[PDB]
Subunit: 314 residues, 3 copies
């Protein structure tokens, strides 16, 4: 199978600059070369150049709508392109608003895909419910079929078509949900595993259940959108919105190893790595290294070890 890396050095979805440096830091850490060591064919598409929309006035509370909408339209085009050729798309953020383009493009080719969202947040604030006009906290609102017409059309997003329903998404790691968002997920009946279900069940059973929920009836492509703040700040401190009490490095790797085993991974997002938010160089290195480890894990790297087939090492 083929892997295509696409860097989305974008940050207008939130107020903290620096996430645009994310793809660079990940490449600098040897992400691409380490992936070539796996059984996959790797092709680096490079970073996308995002044109800045001048005079991008905020829409009500929503900041940089046009700049975010345009960058996402462009990303969706690139992703649909790679997906069409039958390759696996790996997007390196950038803030989480880029999931709009990533998932949209992916869904054009695989309309029946399901999404596993790993994040401390639901990121499902609608333009009417946000306390800040920050779009990184609103991706899922733009993708749900059930949220269509429940919020005014935003400048720059008219190309978007709600591709997935409430039945096709599962959240893992939740621990910082606004009252509005919580209202939404309860009302829509969206399956989730907050830190409390993880604590109650253990990560092993959490994965068993998300799989029987999403793949029980039909086997379909999986899109894993991974916000690095889903792990505890001790492992991924260099992020914009760290929340204590998160998934451990072990649980994170467990998630990715189980996904790899399904043989159904189709799209992957490694989002919110912000190299400029590390208090010490080691905090940055810690964050990058774990992002890299999770990516490699999605593609076969096992903790029990790996050996090349047909090679008699004796």
């Amino acid at each position: 199978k083929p892997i295509e890396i696409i860097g989305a050095p974008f940050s207008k979805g939130q107020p903290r600059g620096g996430v645009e440096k994310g793809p660079a830091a990940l490449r600098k850490a040897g992400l691409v070369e380490k992936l070539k060591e796996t059984e996959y064919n790797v092709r680096d598409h490079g970073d996308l150049a995002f044109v800045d929309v001048p005079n991008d006035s905020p829409f009500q509370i929503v900041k940089n709508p046009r700049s975010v909408g345009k960058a996402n339209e462009q990303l969706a085009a690139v992703v649909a392109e790679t997906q069409k050729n039958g390759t696996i798309s790996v997007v390196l953020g950038g803030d989480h608003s880029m999931a709009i383009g990533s998932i949209s493009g992916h869904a054009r080719v695989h309309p029946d895909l399901c999404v596993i969202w790993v994040d401390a947040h639901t990121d499902i604030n609608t333009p009417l419910t946000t306390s800040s006009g920050n779009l990184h906290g609103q991706p899922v609102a733009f993708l749900l079929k059930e949220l269509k017409g429940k919020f005014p059309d935003v400048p720059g997003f008219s190309w978007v078509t709600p591709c997935i329903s409430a039945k096709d998404i599962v959240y893992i790691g939740l621990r910082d949900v606004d009252p509005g968002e919580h209202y939404i997920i309860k009302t829509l009946g969206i399956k989730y595993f907050s830190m409390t279900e993880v604590d109650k069940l253990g990560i092993g059973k959490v994965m068993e259940e998300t799989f029987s929920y999403l793949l029980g009836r039909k086997k379909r492509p999986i899109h894993l959108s991974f916000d690095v703040d889903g792990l505890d700040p001790v492992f991924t401190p260099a992020t914009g919105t760290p929340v204590v009490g998160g998934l451990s490095y072990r649980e994170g790797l467990y998630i990715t190893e189980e996904i790899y085993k399904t043989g159904l991974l189709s799209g992957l997002d490694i989002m919110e790595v912000n190299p400029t938010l590390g208090k010490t160089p080691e905090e940055v290195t810690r964050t990058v290294n774990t992002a890299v480890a999770l990516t490699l894990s999605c593609f076969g790297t096992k903790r029990e070890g790996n050996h090349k087939p047909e090679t008699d090492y004796l």
Copy 2:
């Protein structure tokens, strides 16, 4: 339901001055304001002023017996008062000896209550078994019916009436038990989950079993006495007796979330926060913050989120 915060700025139960500042630090961190945002009606009763007993000579090894006994008599009077009017009492320590008064007063109104003690310690040393005369390590000895007359009467504690039996208490988090205390818990058949049972069972099953043990036959009010050293020093470093290998921030929140769900929480103690023991201001901040988080969780704050009823956020 109504909540009433009662501060017990007392420290004579142990040698390290500082726990008296506990209530102030917790209020300073916005505990009361954040509690008002919940569905509960909150009333801050202020801090109790304890009269110092001059010439408080030690009773054998037992230090400050009269000061501790008197402060507890006054606290018991206050708690019995609030409980009577049908409100939930929340005591902010202060060292753990104040549990004598908090639980005594609570039992005057709800004689059939049960106690869930979260601590790294059993705090069940009798005046005869203590290696130090410190009363913060002896609360439970004074409250147990099965321990009546097994130790000489102490000056200042004649008002105390053993209110709960060995069948009504469950310990969680044990990892530092003296040989004597160990002998007592084994002999009396007290249900406990030391760190090894937590490790073996997982916090989810630990809670399931404590509830089936304490509420299996009769549903009765619950008194949760929470010693902050029950959690690992990594989370609550600002305490007088930190012991490595404790409960995680996650397990602590899981305990409080499950207790909230029973609908039976009647009394709560947040003990042993000592602001002066932090090696760095961040250490004190870390400690206070988690204490606040545990309190809020007892009253409904969930990690999956919360939304006000009847409010259509769309």
Copy 3:
């Protein structure tokens, strides 16, 4: 029962100097004295003085083969001696290559022993598969009967006799396995619990299965070879090969308590503690304290507490 402490201040099994200081650091922390407080009789045999083999030319890739072979021949003699007298041998490393003599010696007396190997690494590289000629990463290759004749004879190891088979060893904590080693364990059918099985099952069920696997049929002497890097670097940072995502302090203690409860502990190795690799004095203190705690745990110290039998504490 009797315990005999044997110090193995040896470091030629790997490139980083400092592990020889391991035994001194452990003794300085009061290990021997703390052991005497347990129900066991303790005899400290002191530290073995290892004769350095001049002109120890590498065997192909393999470094210091003769020095390592000789130090291990001498250690095996000592251990066979103490085991013969019916005492429990406790070896203080020193690098993990010393497990060759430690297990060899033990097996001469107890041929039916089983081995529980706690380590991040399988340490099963053969002289032909090592990327570095370091012998600390090859102990098990020399002990396995199934690996006899699969690699050339090494200068200094002619005295070694493969004592255990693939059926007698269980690995716990694996998270850094070379391709070659992974091929070997998979081919030979060796039972193991990598961090992913630990995540999936929980330390409790992991221990239940290693016991039914090794002792289900015949109860036999247990040799526990413990490499301190088996625990996460947060607990044991002063080692030569730290790998993130390891066993916690709590899981490590759980392992030792369960082993203690079997009543079959016969031999114990506490390897890889390197004092000179701590970045701050505290890091060395943290490493030493947890190694001491694990040792005392094997010999009865429980987290729920201990009380001396026949002493009425009331």
